[PDB]
Design a protein around this ligand. Structure first.
Ligand SMILES: Nc1ncnc2c1ncn2[C@@H]1O[C@H](COP(=O)(O)OP(=O)(O)OP(O)(O)=S)[C@@H](O)[C@H]1O
Ligand SMILES: Nc1ncnc2c1ncn2[C@@H]1O[C@H](COP(=O)(O)OP(=O)(O)OP(O)(O)=S)[C@@H](O)[C@H]1O
Ligand SMILES: Nc1ncnc2c1ncn2[C@@H]1O[C@H](COP(=O)(O)OP(=O)(O)O)[C@@H](O)[C@H]1O
Ligand SMILES: Nc1ncnc2c1ncn2[C@@H]1O[C@H](COP(=O)(O)OP(=O)(O)O)[C@@H](O)[C@H]1O
Lengths: 684, 264, 167, 127, 66
């Protein structure tokens, strides 16, 4: 024969129950049977992005052939899974490939249409060394084969819409991703399957949270394959933690260590201590065996329940009379209620932990994938949001108003009250140059997701040309950066949960504001390569200096409201009404006071003492030296980077020179005493 | 031999130009971004015309097609939206000369894609100054006439002859702004009921919202962000405070100058 | 039988101590024991730069099977190391290699889901002459085989990521 | 790893260095464990020159391998052209594979630089 | 010239001969070098310089030497 040599008889497998009873998908099975009951062009192809269960649609079609939900044009049909890889890979020679394939077509035509041929990965058939299309073509035209394809949409439009004859030989059935609730229903059927295998239980809140958080976060793989990945991987982690016991291992190491100690000593007391620890070890071991026996009985009774369900389906196919009522009314409710009695018994007895996969397990598995704070406000990030003013003032002294505004913005977003097409929050930082624009940016990226490195800083001062705009969106096809990628859009597509930091957007060309109009309108910024860039998870922050002299000269005896309205008017003179129209909340910075400069110096002393204690020195400072640093590092035009370069040039250059001179000794208290113009270090 | 329509939505910004088209998409396909949006402020030079149609043979972006023709060759029946149709360069829409004239567009690979079932909508803000100055004491017809003269100063008379109808958006009035606030509060109610809460409001709070969001020069977004701040900041503040308990009616009552949520 | 003809029992060698005391690599044996006990994707492939003892990671898994330091379902498995090289050329006929490999796969169907199979250089399973991929692409989805692959990143990125009925 | 392979560009005296090792075995400049060994170069030619039937070539080759297992490691085998040796008839060199790193078979390789990169480090099963 | 050679050779020494004929953007680049060493080209590749040595030349005080 040929058919047993190359194909996989799926109806025999579904008759042996080795498949998945996939719930739903009723319209796609209907449209596949609409195609398969035609006269010519009997060839549906199942098209969708991978993971959506096109193989499962074919297997569910086979299960409906076996049970008999099909019309009277498919009953008794066999479904055979041709393996396109299993015909190419023997052909060394001229015409041994076509030998096999003509053998397959003669045996299927001997069956006389009684065999629905199934071909998975149909885009292997076309380019496989003329080969396989130009023999199947006279059979696919006359309907004497019954091919069912299964392919990704990209391989469809690449390997078939090219070759138009084999395009019209087939027929599309567009398969869409399932919904969230359909994903939940699918996973409920698959829970009822999977708890036979991993010997555990699954609580349906973990199922719905798994589906929702997988749809929220995993943006490469698609439903339901990613949800099944999460559920199965958590089931395997719990199958580990059945036999992971740690306390028995600690007690065994303790008793063998005290055994070696007592055997070396042969005052004693250790016969008594070892007897107590052996008694505790035996009790924990017997409790462990009791838990194992409980889980074994629960698994066996769950397996007998599922075999009873399979047997009552056997009675639904065959048609025994008393067997139906007997199996149902006896076997289903009593086995379910003592399955729940075993469930509450395991809830009583599992001290040595879980057999029920909770949502925290899903959080641990998805955190091992990516690392998001996946779950909700867990009173650690939530109290962080309740002290988000304090959390931002942990690193950024001063500028209370913008801290409050950004805190309110993220408090709106994490509660789900943002308009979910816009990005998380637009910001127009104003005011004096170099106070903590970038420090608030770093602190925001820090206490948003990870750290200061989950950002993209873009100097907008460099973009002053038309081809600069074509750079930062991406060059259109047939041109240059279309080879070598866009600028902004690639930086977003690498870091999808990030912060975009612009720098002096007023120094940019007067048209990049229109790209920002698209950004702050809807957060899709279609690049040069024609694929969308999704800003709905990010935070766009823009910095400027359009009223730095205006704010520094009028901060005295003017409140926050008049300052905001005045700088709104001035920015309206500079910018356009559309651009400031799309902004969520323009904040206004104020100039710095000398106590804030002293606080910046304090934080620099904190980080410098940390670095030099990692180096190995114990250094103290007089506050007079702090006052000299504060007076030598502020100006109305530059701000606190004068303090930074003053700290660098007056500490980091001379004191490290004194260290490298073999002068200073690690461990000594090093008081940074003052000079007339400098700071001297002593060894005391 | 034409597309279904071809429109030119004019007016000052934020009077509902984009949400009319999203209202179409939510009627027609029951989804907000069930459309094709060519954000025309990227097309400020002619090589981005080569973006939208697809790059020619013997060049880089040949093996992918365009974006527009690929989009419509997938979905033959759609609502093609071209927002901000005058930030772009004046010689971009010659592609749309062909589109509106015959419904055929030739991409790079040489396959004419059928635009006999779409709606080409181009939403401008050219006539913002003239409409904001003279929509008082003028009828609709001469307003359309005069702003169409302004568009003829911007474009060539080839293209505006293709247009099925140019319409004119009027600047918003105060009761319309109150109804905008009502619509925003209704969808806020819907999203928060999906969040699982019982939230009502006093009409005095709505009056204070209308008295804190009116301006003729900016249309509707100051109302939106005023609603955003002066509702969502104390509301989500009390959400993360844990003061909200599900199963409790929340009347957004007034403060002296603010709006407070209550637990009743 | 053919298991005596073409496989290498690691568990007998570790039983007689012929193998090596595997030191460290607790985490990778942990991840292997995870991926070995699922219902889908039941075949790990140990992937790294070559010569880092991926064979000995499988061997230390076998040692922990013998010393009972595994979870309960693995207590009683048999690790067998199928050579790609041992099978090749006793064949003048049109597929005697395929006959012998079919006999081996029927023997592993007879062993009833117990024997855990080892193969290194899994790209040789893909292309070596149906040869070893599509004779086993059924058995890599019919639950009769629990192969443990071992290959470099380049062969995984080419000869496994592409083949979507294997990926 | 009891199998040295020589890696040199073609024509730097690899067979010469193996025969110099053989003369130092004869002259006794080696340690005592190598005093008395036998250096055997495997004749490719006379094996093929009479072969007609199914595996009778490999029958002769397996008989030679059983004689080498009979000699119990007192014979240092040397087969040059190792990249050719891997396929020369389970075929010609992976019959050998368990006997190599067990003290049974000690075949000494000697082969070209690029063909080492062809047929040896890619074929990582014997690496 | 400068940035992409470090991406080719991250393990080397950098010379900038005749820096007296420079331009203030190059001085900005070199202050970015002497601050942290990280420097990104116009298409988005973050390049580190701290594992190298940077050397410059001038020829006016050299004329004072002569
Ligand atoms: N409706 C369903 N009910 C149960 N399981 C399903 C359902 N749809 C998909 N699956 C499972 O999803 C997994 C694979 O889904 P598929 O859609 O078959 O992925 P796929 O068909 O292999 O897609 P590609 O392109 O081949 S990767 C299997 O474990 C199926 O059981
Ligand atoms: N150390 C040496 N002492 C004496 N003659 C040497 C020495 N090294 C090389 N030769 C000579 O160089 C020749 C090289 O012989 P081969 O070893 O066959 O060359 P090869 O480097 O092995 O290249 P192939 O692969 O054998 S053709 C020897 O036959 C000697 O004549
Ligand atoms: N409020 C603050 N708290 C702590 N440190 C700050 C604060 N404001 C500024 N700094 C320091 O001041 C400097 C300002 O530099 P930067 O923010 O890059 O310039 P600009 O202020 O023009 O944006 C930063 O390098 C930072 O180290
Ligand atoms: N746990 C271990 N401790 C010490 N050495 C090890 C360990 N595991 C493997 N090795 C060494 O690795 C070598 C095997 O390399 P291997 O990783 O099997 O090959 P490959 O390069 O094909 O992956 C052995 O010689 C062994 O000594």
């Amino acid at each position: 024969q040929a058919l047993k040599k190359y194909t996989i008889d799926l109806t025999e497998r579904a008759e042996q129950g080795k498949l998945d009873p996939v719930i739903g998908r009723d319209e796609e099975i209907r449209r596949t049977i609409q195609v398969l009951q035609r006269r010519t062009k009997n060839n549906p192809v199942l098209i969708g992005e991978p993971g959506v269960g096109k193989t499962a649609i074919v297997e569910g079609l086979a299960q409906r052939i076996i049970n008999g939900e099909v019309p009277e044009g498919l009953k008794g049909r066999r479904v055979l899974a041709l393996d396109m890889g299993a015909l190419v890979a023997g052909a060394k020679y001229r015409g041994e490939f076509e030998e096999r394939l003509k053998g397959v077509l003669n045996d299927l035509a001997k069956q006389e249409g009684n065999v629905i041929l199934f071909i998975d990965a149909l885009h292997t058939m076309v380019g496989a060394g003329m080969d396989a299309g130009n023999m199947l073509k006279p059979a696919l035209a006359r309907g004497e084969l019954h091919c069912v394809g299964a392919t990704t949409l990209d391989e469809y439009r690449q390997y078939i819409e090219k070759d138009a004859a084999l395009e019209r030989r087939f027929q599309k059935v567009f398969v869409a991703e399932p919904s969230v609730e359909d994903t939940i229903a699918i996973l409920r059927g698959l829970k009822e399957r999977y708890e036979l295998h991993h010997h555990v239980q699954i609580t349906d809140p973990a199922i719905v949270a798994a589906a929702t958080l997988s749809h929220r976060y995993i943006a490469d793989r698609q439903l339901p394959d990613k949800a099944i990945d999460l559920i199965d991987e958590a089931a395997s982690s719990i199958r580990m933690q059945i036999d992971s016991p740690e306390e028995l291992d600690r007690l065994d190491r303790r008793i063998i260590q005290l055994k070696l100690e007592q055997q070396a000593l042969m005052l004693d007391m250790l016969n008594e201590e070892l007897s107590d620890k052996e008694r505790q070890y035996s009790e924990l071991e017997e409790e462990w065996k009791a838990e194992k026996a409980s889980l074994s009985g629960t698994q066996t009774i769950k397996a007998e329940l599922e075999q009873a369900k399979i047997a009552i389906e056997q009675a639904r196919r065959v048609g025994d009379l008393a067997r139906m009522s007997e199996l149902q009314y006896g076997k289903i409710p009593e086995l379910e209620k003592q399955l729940e009695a075993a469930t509450q018994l395991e809830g009583k007895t599992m001290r040595l932990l879980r057999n029920k996969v909770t949502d925290a397990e899903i959080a641990e598995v998805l955190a091992r994938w990516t690392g998001i704070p996946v779950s909700r406000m867990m009173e650690s990030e939530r109290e962080k949001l309740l002290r988000m003013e304090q959390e931002l003032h942990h690193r950024v002294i001063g500028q209370n108003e913008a801290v409050d505004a950004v805190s309110n913005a993220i408090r709106r977003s994490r509660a789900g009250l943002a308009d979910p097409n816009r990005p998380i929050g637009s910001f127009l930082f104003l005011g004096p140059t170099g106070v903590g624009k970038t420090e608030l940016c770093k602190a925001l990226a820090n206490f948003m997701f990870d750290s200061d490195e989950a950002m993209v800083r873009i100097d907008m001062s460099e973009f002053m040309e038309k081809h600069s705009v074509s750079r930062l969106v991406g060059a259109p096809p047939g041109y240059v950066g279309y080879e070598e990628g866009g600028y902004l859009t690639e930086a977003v597509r690498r870091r999808p949960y990030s912060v975009i930091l612009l720098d002096a957007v007023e120094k940019a060309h007067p048209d990049v504001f229109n790209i920002l109009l698209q950004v702050l309108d809807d957060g899709r910024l279609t690049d040069g390569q024609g694929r969308t860039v999704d800003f709905r998870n990010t935070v766009v922050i823009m910095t400027s200096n359009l009223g730095s002299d205006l704010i520094q000269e009028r901060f005295g005896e003017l409140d926050y409201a008049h300052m905001k309205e005045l700088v709104l008017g001035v920015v309206s003179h500079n910018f356009r009404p559309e651009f400031i129209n799309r902004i969520d909340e323009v904040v206004v910075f104020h100039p710095l006071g000398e106590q804030h400069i002293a606080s910046i110096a304090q934080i620099q002393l904190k980080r410098l003492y940390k670095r030099l204690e990692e180096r190995g020195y114990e250094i103290h400072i007089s506050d007079e030296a702090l006052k000299l640093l504060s007076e030598n590092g502020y100006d109305p035009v530059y701000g606190a980077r004068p303090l930074k370069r003053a700290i660098q040039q007056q500490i980091e250059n001379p004191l490290a020179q004194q260290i490298l001179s073999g002068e200073l000794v690690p461990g000594k208290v090093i008081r940074l005493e003052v000079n007339e113009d400098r700071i001297v270090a002593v060894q005391h």
